[PDB]
Amino acid sequence: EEDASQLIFPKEFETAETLLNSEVHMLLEHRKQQNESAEDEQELSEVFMKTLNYTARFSRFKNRETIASVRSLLLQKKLHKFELACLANLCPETAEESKALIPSLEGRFEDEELQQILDDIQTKRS
Amino acid sequence: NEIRATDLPERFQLRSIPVKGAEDDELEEEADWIYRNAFATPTISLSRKGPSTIQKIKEALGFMRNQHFEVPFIAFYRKEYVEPELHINDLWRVWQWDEKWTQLRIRKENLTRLFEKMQAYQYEQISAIRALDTTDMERLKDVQSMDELKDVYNHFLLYYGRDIPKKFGLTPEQFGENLRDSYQRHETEQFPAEPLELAKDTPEAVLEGARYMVALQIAREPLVRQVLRQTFQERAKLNITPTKKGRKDVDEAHYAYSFKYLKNKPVKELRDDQFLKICLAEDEGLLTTDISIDLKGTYFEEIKQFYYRDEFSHQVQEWNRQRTMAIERALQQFLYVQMAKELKNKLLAEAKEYVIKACSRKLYNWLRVAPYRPDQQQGKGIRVLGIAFSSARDHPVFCALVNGEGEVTDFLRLPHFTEEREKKAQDIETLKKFLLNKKPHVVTVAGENRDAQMLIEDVKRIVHELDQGQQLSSIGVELVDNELAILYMNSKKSEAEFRDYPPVLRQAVSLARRIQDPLIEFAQVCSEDILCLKFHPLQEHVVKEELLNALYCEFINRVNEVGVDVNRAIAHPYSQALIQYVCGLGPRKGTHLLKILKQNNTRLESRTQLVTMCHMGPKVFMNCAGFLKIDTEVLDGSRVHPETYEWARKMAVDALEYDESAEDANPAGALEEILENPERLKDLDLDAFAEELERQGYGDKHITLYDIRAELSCRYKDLRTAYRSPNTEEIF
Amino acid sequence: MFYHISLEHEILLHPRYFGPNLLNTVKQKLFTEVEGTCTGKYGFVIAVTTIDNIGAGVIQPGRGFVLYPVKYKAIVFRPFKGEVVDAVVTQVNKVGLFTEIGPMSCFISRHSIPSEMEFDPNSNPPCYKTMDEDIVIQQDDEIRLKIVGTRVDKNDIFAIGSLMDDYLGLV
RNA sequence: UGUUUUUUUCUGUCUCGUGCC
Numbered sequence A: 001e002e003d004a005s006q007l008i009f010p011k012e013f014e015t016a017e018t019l020l021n022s023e024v025h026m027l028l029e030h031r032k033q034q035n036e037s038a039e040d041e042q043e044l045s046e047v048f049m050k051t052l053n054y055t056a057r058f059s060r061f062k063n064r065e066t067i068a069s070v071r072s073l074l075l076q077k078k079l080h081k082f083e084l085a086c087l088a089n090l091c092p093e094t095a096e097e098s099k100a101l102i103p104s105l106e107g108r109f110e111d112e113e114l115q116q117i118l119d120d121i122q123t124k125r126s
Numbered sequence B: 001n002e003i004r005a006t007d008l009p010e011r012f013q014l015r016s017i018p019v020k021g022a023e024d025d026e027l028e029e030e031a032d033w034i035y036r037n038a039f040a041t042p043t044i045s046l047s048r049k050g051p052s053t054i055q056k057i058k059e060a061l062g063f064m065r066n067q068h069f070e071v072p073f074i075a076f077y078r079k080e081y082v083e084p085e086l087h088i089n090d091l092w093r094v095w096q097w098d099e100k101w102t103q104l105r106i107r108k109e110n111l112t113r114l115f116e117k118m119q120a121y122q123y124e125q126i127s128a129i130r131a132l133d134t135t136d137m138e139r140l141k142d143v144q145s146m147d148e149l150k151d152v153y154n155h156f157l158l159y160y161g162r163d164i165p166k167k168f169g170l171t172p173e174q175f176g177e178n179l180r181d182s183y184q185r186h187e188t189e190q191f192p193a194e195p196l197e198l199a200k201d202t203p204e205a206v207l208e209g210a211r212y213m214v215a216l217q218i219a220r221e222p223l224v225r226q227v228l229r230q231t232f233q234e235r236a237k238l239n240i241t242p243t244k245k246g247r248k249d250v251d252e253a254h255y256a257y258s259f260k261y262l263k264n265k266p267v268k269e270l271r272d273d274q275f276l277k278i279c280l281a282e283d284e285g286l287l288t289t290d291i292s293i294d295l296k297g298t299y300f301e302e303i304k305q306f307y308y309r310d311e312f313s314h315q316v317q318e319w320n321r322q323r324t325m326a327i328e329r330a331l332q333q334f335l336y337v338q339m340a341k342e343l344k345n346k347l348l349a350e351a352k353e354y355v356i357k358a359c360s361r362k363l364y365n366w367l368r369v370a371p372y373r374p375d376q377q378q379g380k381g382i383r384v385l386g387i388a389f390s391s392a393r394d395h396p397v398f399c400a401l402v403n404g405e406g407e408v409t410d411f412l413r414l415p416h417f418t419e420e421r422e423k424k425a426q427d428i429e430t431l432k433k434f435l436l437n438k439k440p441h442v443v444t445v446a447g448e449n450r451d452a453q454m455l456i457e458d459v460k461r462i463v464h465e466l467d468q469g470q471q472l473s474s475i476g477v478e479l480v481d482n483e484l485a486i487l488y489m490n491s492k493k494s495e496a497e498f499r500d501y502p503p504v505l506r507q508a509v510s511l512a513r514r515i516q517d518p519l520i521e522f523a524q525v526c527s528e529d530i531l532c533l534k535f536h537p538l539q540e541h542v543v544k545e546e547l548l549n550a551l552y553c554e555f556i557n558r559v560n561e562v563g564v565d566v567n568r569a570i571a572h573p574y575s576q577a578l579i580q581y582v583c584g585l586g587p588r589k590g591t592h593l594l595k596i597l598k599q600n601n602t603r604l605e606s607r608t609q610l611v612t613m614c615h616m617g618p619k620v621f622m623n624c625a626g627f628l629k630i631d632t633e634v635l636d637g638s639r640v641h642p643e644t645y646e647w648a649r650k651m652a653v654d655a656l657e658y659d660e661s662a663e664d665a666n667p668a669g670a671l672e673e674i675l676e677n678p679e680r681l682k683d684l685d686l687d688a689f690a691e692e693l694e695r696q697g698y699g700d701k702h703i704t705l706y707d708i709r710a711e712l713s714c715r716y717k718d719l720r721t722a723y724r725s726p727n728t729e730e731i732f
Numbered sequence C: 001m002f003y004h005i006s007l008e009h010e011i012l013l014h015p016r017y018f019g020p021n022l023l024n025t026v027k028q029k030l031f032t033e034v035e036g037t038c039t040g041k042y043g044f045v046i047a048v049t050t051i052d053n054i055g056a057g058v059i060q061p062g063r064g065f066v067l068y069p070v071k072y073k074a075i076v077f078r079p080f081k082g083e084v085v086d087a088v089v090t091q092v093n094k095v096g097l098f099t100e101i102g103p104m105s106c107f108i109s110r111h112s113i114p115s116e117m118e119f120d121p122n123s124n125p126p127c128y129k130t131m132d133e134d135i136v137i138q139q140d141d142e143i144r145l146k147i148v149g150t151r152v153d154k155n156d157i158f159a160i161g162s163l164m165d166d167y168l169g170l171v
Numbered sequence D: 001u002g003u004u005u006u007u008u009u010c011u012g013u014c015u016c017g018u019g020c021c
Helices: A021-036 A046-058 A064-075 A082-090 A095-101 A111-124 B010-015 B024-036 B050-067 B071-076 B091-126 B135-141 B146-160 B172-181 B209-219 B222-228 B246-250 B267-271 B274-283 B300-305 B315-334 B336-367 B426-437 B450-465 B484-489 B492-497 B503-514 B518-523 B537-541 B544-562 B587-600 B618-623 B645-656 B669-676 B686-695 B704-713 C022-031
Strands: B384-388 B398-403 B407-412 B442-445 B477-479 C002-013 C043-053 C066-077 C084-092 C096-100 C107-109 C142-146
Touching: A021 A046, A021 A064, A021 C043, A046 C043, A046 C084, A064 A082, A064 A111, A082 A095, A082 C084, A095 A111, B010 B071, B010 B091, B010 B587, B010 B618, B024 B050, B024 B091, B050 B071, B050 B091, B050 B618, B071 B091, B071 B544, B091 B135, B091 B146, B091 B544, B135 B146, B135 B222, B146 B209, B146 B222, B172 B209, B172 B222, B209 B315, B222 B336, B267 B274, B267 B336, B274 B336, B274 B537, B300 B315, B315 B336, B336 B537, B336 B544, B384 B484, B384 B503, B398 B503, B407 B426, B407 B503, B426 B450, B442 B450, B442 B503, B450 B477, B484 B492, B484 B503, B484 B518, B492 B503, B503 B518, B518 B544, B537 B544, B645 B669, B645 B686, B645 B704, B669 B704, B686 B704, C002 C022, C002 C043, C022 C043, C022 C066
Parallel strands: B384 B442, B442 B477
Antiparallel strands: B384 B398, B398 B407, C002 C066, C043 C066, C084 C096, C084 C142, C096 C107
16 A cells, blocks of 8 residues: 555654755765764665765755755645655756656646656756 | 587687688788788797698698698698697697688678668768768778777767768878878868857857767778877886885886886787786786886977968968877877777786786696606506605505506505604604505605605605615606696596595505606696696786696697596506597597497407497598507507508518508508617608608608608607706706 | 654662662663564664663562663664555565565565566576566666565565555656 | 594373361
């Protein structure tokens, strides 16, 4: 029954806080910077390294202010939290591609209304 | 059915997998590809010269495509068309070169088709920085440039777009030409405009908009790849230097840890020296590796002047700055990284080649069949007394007395040993009783440490002093290293021959077999079995597929040179399953022939048994004519095939000066007299034989004349080495 | 998908750890206990960002061990069905494709892949192309996919991908 | 130029009577 396409999740996960690829990337980078210092400490595990090299290959923007602006210009809408991560991470070109990938956008908003948002997201990319 | 009842042999089909045969026009292309890709970095096949080597490779490829020839079948049967004994890796190298040429041709054809389709799509779209379909022809023509061709194709796809519905600085071609020639023939955009004006005509308000496009164009340009290719791969003084943690973790075990400050290792040390490449790969795996040419700091400076404007007064200065920025962006995108990746790939290839060469050398050294038969040739062979003891410390040591016909006659144990702290007679008495129990022909003792060597020496001394070798003579117990017999004792053959026997008996049997017929043991093993023996530590770093292929080729060549006994693999299990590494007779074909022989009960009547009994096809018989041998026609158990049977008979008659009347069996003076010993060699002239072959036969017999004479004079010639007695260092 | 939620956990601290570094020791124990693990309720956990508070240690009767019900603010990665992400191809095989969704590895079969993407076993690098050879997909490429299934192999998530929806490849 | 050993908590039934603080 758990299918994110139809906007359904358990009760505990419904009250979660979404994270973007750049956000998690900078969080892990800062954690690494803090951990590497303060000698006599247990070093990072393979999980941290794989997650780092996995999120580093999808960092659409390095500036934190870019993350702040792209979340601010998005939260003003009426979309759910789930629509804040996938759409901000994939960065599709045209509204048709976004509507095809995410079935929730089908009929939820107009075409130009989503195309303008996608163009803004593309421009915000570094 | 297709492997055993196929028109072409199994080896020929397996060799030309990517290229199903060679056409008349494609033979020249394959030969050119093989010659070009025969020895680029190291010197290989420079023997055969350049043009002569290319011609020989082309002839071998043509023979393989037409007559379904194979590696040994073309190296021996086509000694004239290919290098006449230029090197051992003649047929295999030719097959690899032909396969590479065919693959390159197929890739070039696919690239040309893709380029034509893209050009047609572009013409249809824009015909109703442009997009022209002119590079498709270049990509299709670039058959030799595989990596460069792929890079150019990828760059073209990323530049034109790759979409399939159903003025910023210098041009890319001019920049590439100026970089390749070393002189900047074309400068940047010599216009009054600067990045301020160019960053407003996209919607970014940043001066780095055109830099990204310039970098993408430079990186995705085949000319750039060609110019950078070979510049650092040809020479790269890789400085090996351990890091902070690698110095202690390596402990001077790898290439990047043996020399604390031993840097400046050129490509010769990594390519030619496979050990260095293996060490660098191992060190670069976990801890770290020191692989840096350190030669760019000066190779990247010369490119900086090229593609940039010379004047500086706003327009000229702005153009020069923009060109410098674009060059830097392109270099950072695919300039240093591409060169480093190419150098790493070249180093890995060199390490793999070195590992494969070491494995092939080890296989050639250890595969030569050099048994120790009676008199170093009563009864056929000698009775090898395989003595494979466990400890020699009051424990039962296996001691089997196998016969010389690929079978074990008997065995026994010797629990008494010098067990007892002070007992110098029990071991001697046990050895005397064991020697008197049977009548072996030779002693094959093993060794593990000083105690084992002392026990072997004591046993040999007791046998020689009391004449325990045959009961009526002293027999020298030949030392045998416990290397092949230990592995063969616990193999499938050892288990099948004896199931309810201790491991000592199996080890003794394996040791006895290894010192009687190494070829039989090598052919009767899985090749798994060959992979058990390590050829060198550097082979592990390189791909094991190349080593396995080299070992298989060496085994096939050895089998073809020594031949196969048809009757030996009919009833004797020890000398069975030896039709897997024959020239043109593959494993499936050999298994089918063995099954047919076991069912129908057909014996090795002559060379045409598989052509007359309907067991093997004409191509199979022709390709495997020089490898199948029988016990008894006269020229069946030799390299003389049916085609050269008449020529061999005529040559033997002329040398023996006997009558000529349809000599196949009936005249024996020319056949039996010449087989017994050399009757007359001056009677048979090389020029006369060659002229006869050319006029009637459709082939020159200048190179095959010697082989035919040897086959007529000596049948079933063995290509294995002689018996190698253990030495001091070798014994240890 | 990565998320930031508030979790709770308790750890017994042996009395030998009492002293001026009690809180530091509790934090150190927390770090090396709930990092990298996985559970079927909240999913795979990456690491811990910060800790909310340290509860009151209730010393157990007759045992020196004391438990601290700490509530930490850590991140978690619990992919669901239907989500679309961007991963990287790790290996190409005739049996199927292998990718790496961060701490999880999915797998797509040839059946999911359209018939246009054929095999290239002749070429040294295993790759899939079309008849015209325009589009090329190989390893180390940011290729998208769809999570059509989930699985947890005893705290080891292993989902399954798919390649039927359009616009799934090179961006 | 040598020196012989390694296996271990078992476990018993339901009933009646007598004596003691």
